[PDB]
Amino acid sequence: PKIGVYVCHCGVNIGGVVDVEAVRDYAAKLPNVVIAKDYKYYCSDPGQLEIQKDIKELGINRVVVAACSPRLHEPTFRRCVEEAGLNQFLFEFANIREHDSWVHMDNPEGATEKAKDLVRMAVAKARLLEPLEASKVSVDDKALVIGGGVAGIQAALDLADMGFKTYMVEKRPSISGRMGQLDKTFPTLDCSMCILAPKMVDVGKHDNIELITYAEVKEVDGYIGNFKVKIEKKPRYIDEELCTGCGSCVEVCPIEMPNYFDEGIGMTKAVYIPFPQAVPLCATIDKDYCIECMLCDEVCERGAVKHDQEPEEIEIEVGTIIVATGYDAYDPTEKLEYGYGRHTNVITGLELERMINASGPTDGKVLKPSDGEKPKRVAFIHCVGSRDEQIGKPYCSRVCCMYIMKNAQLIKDKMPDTEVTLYYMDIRAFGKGFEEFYKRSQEKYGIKFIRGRPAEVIENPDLTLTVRSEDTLLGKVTEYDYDMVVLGVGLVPPEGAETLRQTIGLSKSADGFLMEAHPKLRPVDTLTDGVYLAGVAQGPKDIPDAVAQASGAAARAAIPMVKGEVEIEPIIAVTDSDVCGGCEVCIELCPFGAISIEEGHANVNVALCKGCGTCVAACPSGAMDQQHFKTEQIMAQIEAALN
Amino acid sequence: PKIGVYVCHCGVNIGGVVDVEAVRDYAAKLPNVVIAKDYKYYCSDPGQLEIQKDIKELGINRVVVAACSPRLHEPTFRRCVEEAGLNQFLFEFANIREHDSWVHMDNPEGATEKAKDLVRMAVAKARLLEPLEASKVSVDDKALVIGGGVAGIQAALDLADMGFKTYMVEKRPSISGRMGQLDKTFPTLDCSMCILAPKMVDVGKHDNIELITYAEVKEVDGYIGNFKVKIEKKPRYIDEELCTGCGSCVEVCPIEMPNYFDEGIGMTKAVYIPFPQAVPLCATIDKDYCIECMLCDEVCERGAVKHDQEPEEIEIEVGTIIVATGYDAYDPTEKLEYGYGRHTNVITGLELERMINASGPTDGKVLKPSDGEKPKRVAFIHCVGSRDEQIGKPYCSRVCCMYIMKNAQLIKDKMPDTEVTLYYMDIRAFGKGFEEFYKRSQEKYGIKFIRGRPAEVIENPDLTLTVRSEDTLLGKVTEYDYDMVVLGVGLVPPEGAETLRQTIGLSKSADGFLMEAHPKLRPVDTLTDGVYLAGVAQGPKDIPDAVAQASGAAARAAIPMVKGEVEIEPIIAVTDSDVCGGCEVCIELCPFGAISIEEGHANVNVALCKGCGTCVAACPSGAMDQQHFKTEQIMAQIEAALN
Ligand SMILES: Cc1cc2nc3c(=O)[nH]c(=O)nc-3n(C[C@H](O)[C@H](O)[C@H](O)COP(=O)(O)OP(=O)(O)OC[C@H]3O[C@@H](n4cnc5c(N)ncnc54)[C@H](O)[C@@H]3O)c2cc1C
Ligand SMILES: Cc1cc2nc3c(=O)[nH]c(=O)nc-3n(C[C@H](O)[C@H](O)[C@H](O)COP(=O)(O)OP(=O)(O)OC[C@H]3O[C@@H](n4cnc5c(N)ncnc54)[C@H](O)[C@@H]3O)c2cc1C
Ligand code: SF4
Ligand code: SF4
Ligand code: SF4
Ligand code: SF4
Ligand code: SF4
Ligand code: SF4
Ligand code: SF4
Ligand code: SF4
Ligand code: SF4
Ligand code: SF4
Ligand code: SF4
Ligand code: SF4
């Protein structure tokens, strides 16, 4: 063993506290060490060049680096040594920055002694290291996209245009997500369906996209490039291949049920098409409401009605997964002071979006729920379900300000005589053109802004609503009457989010949305390799941000599939057949079942083993041993820590 | 000619105003028309299937669609007819929605008559159409990335990992952009350099990336897949291949000049390295300050100093371009009431970022410019250079709120006894974890928030600063004294932005940043094919949004390069040699020089012609004629409009 030690100054992060001169000499004087050097920034290109030159010249076969935590830069130095010809796993890392220099600033002498001890432990471990060849595994060039909203549609189209065969699983009968439910979009007031429908048709026609709507992902197993996914397609009771979406079955159906697309304010039949631009344009029967009258069977000319349909099980093999499951609107029923669900003329922002839509339940007319007449006075309340510790929702929903202003502008254009007032804490018009939109809400449409979080909404006997709120800029309490009140509800993770998160094995952030690998530089990656996030799945945001995230997720998922191969770490259990007695107290301790028994000896499957070391710690005789974490290595480290 | 006419209801967008029954019968009765049908949504899959079935059955050779504007759905129907075997350009579009139904709502009868006339004109044009084969052109599988900030670095790394050879042009001597200048990042307060430097090294080592720093893009010519780019590499007067970045030349240099990296508050030598983590780690001589003393030549051991270096011209051929040129910080000198550049202890947010940086000019100490001592009282002013019509800056800069709160928190941690007050209009903490960060600024660090836009900053004789501002929530004027005032300057397009925009040929938005193809669904595309935007080039935003945009831009630019081919529209000039007299009054009228003279006859180059039709309109005898816009076709349309 010819150990080369490299102590990093990291500028003054280590050097400021730890004497990189004494440590270097100590390392040079330790047994088996043939060189000790220090450099200002080893992770940089000059430092890696120095390490490679030292390996080439002095013939170092073991490399020890006294630098930051291995979790940051272990792969960097592993590749550095690889490019110089040395084996990947002859390398050792000493943590003297996060564990020594940054936590013992007031004890420089103790810090230097701790650094000496840690480098001694690292060299003790490095003495007994041996080469290990890492196995390559093929990466399937297929992707799964969960969620058929704007983000999911964008991700699927980008992957399919790059040549990868993509599956798109959607739990609703049709794709579109929440963007299909909007009438217009801010800040341009353009029609959302007019621009989304072509993309939906594209997804429906793409040769590289397999669209599975009305389906859920039930099981996910495996790893990057090698995901096995079990999907459950719910029974439509309509044949997708035969149905043309004419709608005669809907015409004849006698039963009426709520339309999920209309968000509780629209009705359809037990057999329904969610909206005219649905993709696939196919009928669906909800058996909770079907009475099995067979009128739809008799009126259908394609023979597409199948009352004996069963749920179908699909198994796919993919290489990457993109979660694009969006969000649900906050339910403000728990805000008792605002009276949602109790007062007749209190509605939410999404319900208003459905109501203002020309294709919505009311044919685009904003009408009071109480009497079906246009309101003359409308109040909007910001931050409902957001920025509120009384309900455990301390985050901003990021879009409610803008869509509140947009819907106020739309109400003004449709009914210019209407009076509109917004109750806000902050106006968060941060995006491109958002501040101009905010100013236009006042200058052009005459919308009134009151800086005050309403205390209460009181329903009067005539069903009008008094908003009781302080005007904080006038510094006085106001009680103003309105014919309609619209709650600016925030965004929450969708129903069934935890089930899918556990199925895939992802973590979630403090707000309840899925967590990205790094907040700053890996916004669309997760810590699970081969799984990516796009859109509001990662947190509330508007359509362009979700689309950018979907494109980025497509690129990130394409990178490994283009590479076609990934490396498996060889830190795995190995059994000594000559020592193993076949006691088998190790097999059950493997959560992945990597250990079996062949010829009376324990045998580990590399594909199943993950390298936890539990079995090795359990083995009394020591027949089992983990590569790179052998018992002798840890024992040497323990001995060096105290001697 | 067997013309099939298809009138779209578009739901009620046309049908509501225009009688799609009378128009269909009129079309059926017109000469050469063999079928007339109407469908609720023709652009949808069922409508395209209907059109294809009609073409296959009745043998239609001309297709006319009375629907929305051609600029929206002409490619859709072109591909629809292609997939049924018909030629792409036998297709005609009548605009009866944007031009008739949506603009004559109060005259339904006049609307229907106008629709009849427009369909008659469309059929008149379609009678004389003929097939045209479109030529394919290869797409170069190479990309250029302009700008070496976080967005540009991300885009280049994503493209290079997908296998494409990428050029990265950077005007500064080193990559990093503005993220390298930050000390920490919000909302996590993690070190920005610690996470950016590995990416910079990766860019510097990638086999698929050619990094050209200290260079500018001078000329761009051509089109998607076929861009010819002329780049000018400025002379460093240091040999990049030889320089190791040791810094001895800096040690010996006698001249002192401002360091651009330190934003006007840091000094370096005439030969300088912008920062220790620079990529490439190379020296640069600024000849505005060099006195040619040759001390650097004598102290350099690599012989890397080249005082006779000249600017170099590089010509590259690429298929896609990604603009990632970032932003500049607003210069608040024009806000005379705040006294920047006049008061000693008034600084900007970016200057404070450099000052709080441990590697900055002051070694991470926040010191007053007047006396070099720590301030005891600090004020932050929000929205400086933003949301202000007095300076023509009506937009939000979107990050100043958060980095103001972050730098206040950093000042508190470094100097807990310091008092910090923020003067704000709205707190825009919209991002993930931003509202929690905002609350933590108060609960944990005790930062004071005053809702008021300061009227004035007055320098007192002792050089302290009185902020005169209304507290609007107390409703009273306040005059508070501070040792330091930090202006929360906004983001503006970088210097030289207009030159590069004109060089490429891009448009800009109202705020001055580059304009995307569609605000909602194409945030990273431009209307110039093959050119994409990433990061703050498209508008102010934070690091994760810029990184998502960079990944999306990489994916979008990869799509056409994976396809490897694009179609050229055949709407081009054609000369009748038997009629052309070689008068040549057409050649100079082509801005692209597509027309030359061979054998005494005008000859058009397809590669140069773009299809404006100017030459055809100029030709008296009619020898020149534009394909798909022939004189006979327009004359027939004129005749049908009036008869
Ligand atoms: C009232 C309102 C108005 C708005 N107005 C605007 C506006 O004007 N402009 C703007 O830019 N933004 C607006 N937004 C925000 C915008 O809707 C979002 O940015 C966008 O919808 C996010 O798209 P997405 O694909 O990430 O999610 P979604 O649109 O929610 O789509 C997610 C999809 O995933 C599906 N799904 C969920 N769970 C599963 C599962 N387990 N398996 C399979 N599929 C699943 C859902 O059914 C859905 O189809 C508005 C939001 C609201 C509430
Ligand atoms: C004081 C301050 C603090 C901030 N703090 C944070 C924070 O804590 N967290 C956060 O997420 N964001 C923060 N931001 C915002 C963040 O800096 C931006 O989101 C990010 O820098 C944008 O990266 P970019 O690559 O788009 O642009 P830039 O970082 O500006 O990089 C653009 C690059 O293009 C180069 N370039 C320009 N013109 C040309 C040309 N013609 N040819 C070639 N190259 C060219 C530039 O030299 C530069 O290297 C802060 C901003 C400021 C001003
Ligand atoms: S190797 Fe680690 S400690 Fe050394 S400079 Fe790099 S990040 Fe800092
Ligand atoms: S089931 Fe039959 S009748 Fe109903 S929409 Fe489908 S094709 Fe039409
Ligand atoms: S069988 Fe069910 S879906 Fe069909 S018409 Fe009767 S109630 Fe409606
Ligand atoms: S975006 Fe506006 S309305 Fe929505 S939570 Fe944030 S501050 Fe409240
Ligand atoms: S515990 Fe040890 S001895 Fe027993 S079967 Fe496992 S490896 Fe063999
Ligand atoms: S190391 Fe862990 S995963 Fe591997 S065989 Fe032993 S118990 Fe199973
Ligand atoms: S073809 Fe045009 S007019 Fe007809 S439905 Fe589609 S978008 Fe509307
Ligand atoms: S020019 Fe020479 S002395 Fe100066 S940094 Fe480069 S190698 Fe070192
Ligand atoms: S020649 Fe110029 S750069 Fe070199 S030491 Fe002299 S002044 Fe400095
Ligand atoms: S982000 Fe905050 S400080 Fe910056 S312009 Fe917008 S409101 Fe003003
Ligand atoms: S203007 Fe007409 S006649 Fe004259 S050279 Fe051109 S094509 Fe020929
Ligand atoms: S149509 Fe326009 S571009 Fe083409 S040759 Fe004539 S003038 Fe030139």
UniProtKB/Swiss-Prot annotation, chains A, B:
**Where is FAD bound in this sequence?**
147-170
Q: According to its UniProt record, what is one Pfam family this protein matches?
A: Fer4
**Keywords in alphabetical order:** 4Fe-4S, FAD, Flavoprotein, Iron, Iron-sulfur, Metal-binding, Methanogenesis, Oxidoreductase, Repeat
Q: Is Lipid biosynthesis among this UniProt entry's keywords?
A: no
Listed name of the protein: H(2):CoB-CoM heterodisulfide,ferredoxin reductase subunit A
| GO terms (BP aspect) | methanogenesis
Please give the function described in this protein's UniProt entry: Part of a complex that catalyzes the reversible reduction of CoM-S-S-CoB to the thiol-coenzymes H-S-CoM (coenzyme M) and H-S-CoB (coenzyme B).
Disulfide bond entries? none
Superkingdom of the organism of origin = Archaea
Any one GO MF annotation of this record:
CoB--CoM heterodisulfide reductase activity
Q: Which family does it belong to?
A: Belongs to the HdrA family.
**What EC designation does it have?**
1.8.98.5
Catalytic activity reads: coenzyme B + coenzyme M + 2 reduced [2Fe-2S]-[ferredoxin] + 2 H(+) = coenzyme M-coenzyme B heterodisulfide + 2 H2 + 2 oxidized [2Fe-2S]-[ferredoxin]
Q: What is the lineage of its organism?
A: Archaea, Methanobacteriati, Methanobacteriota, Methanomada group, Methanobacteria
SUPFAM superfamilies, per the entry:
4Fe-4S ferredoxins (SSF54862), FAD/NAD(P)-binding domain (SSF51905)
Report the pathway entry. Answer: Cofactor metabolism; coenzyme M-coenzyme B heterodisulfide reduction; coenzyme B and coenzyme M from coenzyme M-coenzyme B heterodisulfide: step 1/1
Ranges where the 4Fe-4S ferredoxin-type domain occurs: 233-263, 281-310, 570-599, 600-629
InterPro entries (UniProt xref):
4Fe4S_Fe-S-bd (IPR017896), 4Fe4S_Fe_S_CS (IPR017900), AlaDH/PNT_NAD(H)-bd (IPR007698), FAD/NAD-bd_sf (IPR036188), FAD/NAD-binding_dom (IPR023753), HdrA-like (IPR039650)
Tell me how the cofactor is bound.
Binds 4 [4Fe-4S] clusters per subunit.
What residues does [4Fe-4S] cluster 4 bind to? 590, 609, 612, 615
Subunit-level organization: The heterodisulfide reductase is composed of three subunits; HdrA, HdrB and HdrC. It forms a complex with the F420-non-reducing hydrogenase (Mvh), which provides the reducing equivalents to the heterodisulfide reductase.
